Amino acid sequence: GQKLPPFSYAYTELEAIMYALGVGASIKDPKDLKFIYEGSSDFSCLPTFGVIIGQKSINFAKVLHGEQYLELYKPLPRAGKLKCEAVVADVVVIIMDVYSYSELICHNQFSLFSDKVKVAVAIPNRPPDAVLTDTTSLNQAALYRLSGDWNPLHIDPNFASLAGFDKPILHGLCTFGFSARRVLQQFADNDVSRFKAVKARFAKPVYPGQTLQTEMWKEGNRIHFQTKVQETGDIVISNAYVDLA
Amino acid sequence: AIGQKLPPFSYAYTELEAIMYALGVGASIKDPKDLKFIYEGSSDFSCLPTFGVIIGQKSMMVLHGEQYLELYKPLPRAGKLKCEAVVADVLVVIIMDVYSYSEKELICHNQFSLFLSDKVKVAVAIPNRPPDAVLTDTTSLNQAALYRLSGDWNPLHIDPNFASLAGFDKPILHGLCTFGFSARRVLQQFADNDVSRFKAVKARFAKPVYPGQTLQTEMWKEGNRIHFQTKVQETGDIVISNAYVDLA
Numbered sequence: 314g315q316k317l318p319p320f321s322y323a324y325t326e327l328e329a330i331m332y333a334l335g336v337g338a339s340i341k342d343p344k345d346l347k348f349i350y351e352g353s354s355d356f357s358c359l360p361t362f363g364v365i366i367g368q369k370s371i372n373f374a375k376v377l378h379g380e381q382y383l384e385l386y387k388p389l390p391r392a393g394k395l396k397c398e399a400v401v402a403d404v405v406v407i408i409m410d411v412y413s414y415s416e417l418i419c420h421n422q423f424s425l426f427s428d429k430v431k432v433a434v435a436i437p438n439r440p441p442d443a444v445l446t447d448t449t450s451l452n453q454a455a456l457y458r459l460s461g462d463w464n465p466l467h468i469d470p471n472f473a474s475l476a477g478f479d480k481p482i483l484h485g486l487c488t489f490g491f492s493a494r495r496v497l498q499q500f501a502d503n504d505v506s507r508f509k510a511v512k513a514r515f516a517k518p519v520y521p522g523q524t525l526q527t528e529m530w531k532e533g534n535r536i537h538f539q540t541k542v543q544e545t546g547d548i549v550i551s552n553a554y555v556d557l558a
Numbered sequence: 559a560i561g562q563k564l565p566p567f568s569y570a571y572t573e574l575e576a577i578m579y580a581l582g583v584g585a586s587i588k589d590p591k592d593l594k595f596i597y598e599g600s601s602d603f604s605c606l607p608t609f610g611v612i613i614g615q616k617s618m619m620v621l622h623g624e625q626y627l628e629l630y631k632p633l634p635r636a637g638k639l640k641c642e643a644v645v646a647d648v649l650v651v652i653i654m655d656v657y658s659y660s661e662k663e664l665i666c667h668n669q670f671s672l673f674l675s676d677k678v679k680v681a682v683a684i685p686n687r688p689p690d691a692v693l694t695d696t697t698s699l700n701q702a703a704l705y706r707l708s709g710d711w712n713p714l715h716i717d718p719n720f721a722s723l724a725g726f727d728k729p730i731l732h733g734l735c736t737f738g739f740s741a742r743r744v745l746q747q748f749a750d751n752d753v754s755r756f757k758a759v760k761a762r763f764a765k766p767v768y769p770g771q772t773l774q775t776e777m778w779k780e781g782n783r784i785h786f787q788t789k790v791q792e793t794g795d796i797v798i799s800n801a802y803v804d805l806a
Contacts, residue, residue, distance in 0.1 A: 327707060331578075334704055340716070340769075341699045349703050350716050451588045455596050456581055456704075459574060468587065468597050521587075 317399040322366050322413065325392040326351035328460070329358040332365060335457035336490030337447055344503055351391070358389040360508035361493045364486055365460050367397055367411040367421035378485050379406065380424035382431040384510035387418050403429040433514040433552035436537045441528040445495045446543055449483065453521040457487040482518040488549055489513055492527040492540045496555045499529060500536045506558070513553035517542075525549075534558065563644040569613045569658070570638035573598035575708070576605040579612060582705035583738030584695055591751055598635070605633040607756035608741045611734055612708050614656040614668035617643045619709050621673035622733055623651070624681055628667045628758035639665060647675040681762040681800035684785045689776040693743045694791060697731065701769045705735040731767040736797055740775040740788045744803045747777060748784045754806070761801035765790075773797075782806070 333348040336359065340349055347355045363383050395418060399411040402422070408430055411421045422431050450456070454467040462484055465472040473481040493511050501507040519525065523542045530537040534557050540550035580595040583606065587596055594602045610627050643656040652672045658665050669679045698704070702715040710732055713720035721729045741759050749755040767773070771790045778785040782805045788798035 330703075331707055334700060339700055340703050343718075346716075346718075349700070351711075352713055352717055452581065452586050452596070455577075455587050459578060459581075463598075465599055468593075469599055470590075470593075472599075 314403075315401050317401065319396065319398045320369050321394065321396050322369060323394040326356065329362055329391065332362050332460045332490070333359050335453070335460055336361070336487060337494050344498065347503060356391055357505040358391055359490070359494060360385055360389065360497065360505055361490045361511065362389055363413070363419035364421060364489070366395055366413050366419060367399070368461055368486075369397065370399055370409070370411070370423070377426040378423070378515060379426040380433060380512070380514045381486065381489060382422040382510070382512045384420045385418070385508060386420070388506045389418065390415070403427045431512055433512055434537065434554050435552055436539050437530045437532060439530070442531050443499060444526060444528040445499060447491050447495065447525040447527070449519065449521055449523050449525060451522045453487060454481060454483045455521070457484050462486070478518065480520060483521050485515040488519050488525060488540060491525050492538055492550060492553070493555060495527045496529060496536050496538055500531055501557050509556040509558060511553065511555040514551045515549070516551050517547040517549050519549050559645055560648045561645060563642065564617065566640060566642045567616060568638060568640045569616045572636040573603065576609055576635065579609050579708050579738070580606050582701070582708055583608070583735060584742050591746065594751055603635055604753040605635055606738070606742060607633065607745065607753060608738050608759065609633055610658070610666035611668060611737070613639055613658050613666060614641055614643075615709055615734075617641065617654075617656055618670070619711070622670065622763065623673040624671035624760070624762045625734065625737060626669035626679035626758070626760045629756060630664050630666060632754050633666065634660070647677045650674045653678050679760055681760055682785065682802050683800055684787050685778040685780060687778070690779050691747055692774060692776040693747060695739050695743065695773040695775070697767070697769055697771050697773060699770045701735060702729060702731050703769075705732055710734070726766070728768060731769050733763040736767050736773060736788055737761055739773050740786055740798060740801070741803060743775045744777060744784050744786055748779060749805050757804040757806050759801065759803040762799045763797070764799050765795040765797050767797050
C-alpha cells in the first residue's frame with residue numbers, strides 16, 4: 314500500500330477540446346459544439362477527461378491496462394490546475410487509486426495487469442435499449458495520443474508487430490472515451506453535471522479506422538454498456554456502466 | 559507607422575505542437591510516409607516547413623490576403639524562438655514582416671499581407687500550360703476545429719453565428735490551413751518529404767473553403783520552383799492562387 318509521489322496537472326480549454334476531438338466529438342453534430350468550441354456559452358469539459366488528469370503514471374512495457382474507474386465528485390472545470398495523489402490500494406494485478414484535488418474533484422482507479430476494488434458489472438440479460446455506432450478515424454490513435462499516452466504501441470508499426478499486432482491498436486481509454494461520450498449524450502442530454510461515475514473492463518483490441526458499436530441498457534440511474542467492433546463483432550469493452558443523476 | 563517595429567515576443571514548442579499542426583493540416587498515417595510528421599518516435603521525425611507560419615503568427619493572435627514564408631534553416635523538432643515584428647510598409651494594405659531567431663541566428667521569415675512597394679514578396683502567375691501534377695485532399699468536417707488548436711482561434715472558423723454576421727454561409731476553413739495542405743503536398747510530390755529542401759513559399763488567398771470540401775492542388779515544376787494553385791473540386795473555385803514554393 315505504498316503512497317506514491319504526488320504530481321500535479323494543469324490544463325486549459327485547449328487540452329480539453331483536444332481530448333474531445335480525439336475521443337469522437339464532431340461539429341457535424343451541433344450539440345457537440347459544446348465540447349469543441351471554448352466560445353460556446355455551454356462549453357464543458359467531457360467527464361472522462363478526468364482519466365487523463367490522473368493518468369500521469371516493474372516493467373511498464375510488461376503492464377496491461379485491465380480496467381478503469383472514474384468518479385466525478387464535481388464537474389470538471391473548463392480549465393484549471395489540480396493536485397494529484399496516487400496511492401497503491403491493493404494487489405498478478407495492481408489496483409491503484411489516484412485522487413485529484415483543486416482547492417477533491419475526481420477519483421481514478423487503474424487496474425493495471427480484494428475488497429478495495431471497484432467491481433465491473435454484468436450487462437442485463439435482454440436486448441439493448443439502444444446502440445449507437447461510431448466510425449473511428451485512420452488517425453484516431455495519432456490524435457488521441459496527443460493527450461498524454463505516447464505508448465508506441467498505438468502508432469509504431471514495427472513496435473506493434475514485435476508486440477504482436479497486425480498493426481498499431483487504438484488506446485483502450487480512447488474507445489472508453491467514445492462510449493462514455495455516447496452514454497452521456499444518449500441518457501443524460503450532454504449534461505456533464507449528471508455524469509457521476511463510469512466503470513469499464515477492456516477486452517479485445519480496436520484498430521484505428523474500425524467502427525465502434527456502443528450498446529446501452531438503462532436500469533434506473535445506471536446505464537450499462539458494452540462496446541463492439543461492427544466488422545468483427547468482437548467485444549472490446551465489457552461489463553461497463555456509468556452512473557447518472 | 560509605415561516602418562514601425564512592434565513588441566518582440568517569443569514562441570516555444572515541442573514535438574506535440576508540431577504534430578498537432580501536421581494533423582490539422584492534412585498529414586495522415588494512412589500514408590506510411592506521413593509517419594515522419596505525426597510520430598515523434600520516427601527516426602525521420604521532422605516539423606513541417608509551413609509550421610513557421612504559426613511561429614510568427616503569434617503576433618496577430620481585416621483580411622489576410624497573402625502569405626510568405628522563408629526557412630533559413632530547417633525548423634527544429636522543438637524549441638524556443640524570439641520573434642520580432644515590423645510594419646514593413648503600408649499601401650489600405652499593410653505588410654508586416656516578422657523574423658524569428660534562435661539566439662542570434664535567424665531561422666524563418668514571414669511576410670503577412672493584411673488587407674483593409676519595393677519591400678514586398680510578390681505573388682507569381684502560374685505557367686500557361688496544363689499542370690504537371692495535381693493531388694486531391696479530402697477535408698474533414700472538423701478540419702477547422704482541429705487546425706484552430708494551433709493558435710488562430712478566430713470564431714469565423716467555428717461559431718455558426720459569428721460566421722454569418724460576417725458574411726458567411728457557415729464557418730470557413732483557415733486560409734493558412736488550406737495553405738498547409740497544398741504546401742505539404744508540394745513537399746511530398748517534388749521534394750521527397752525532405753523538409754530540408756523546402757526553402758520558401760508564397761501564396762495568395764482567394765475564395766473560401768468550407769470544412770469537408772475537397773482540395774485540389776495543381777502543380778507545375780519550373781526548375782527548382784514549384785508553382786501551384788489550389789481549388790475546391792466540387793465548385794471548381796480557386797482558393798489559393800499565384801503561389802509557389804522554392805526547393806533547394
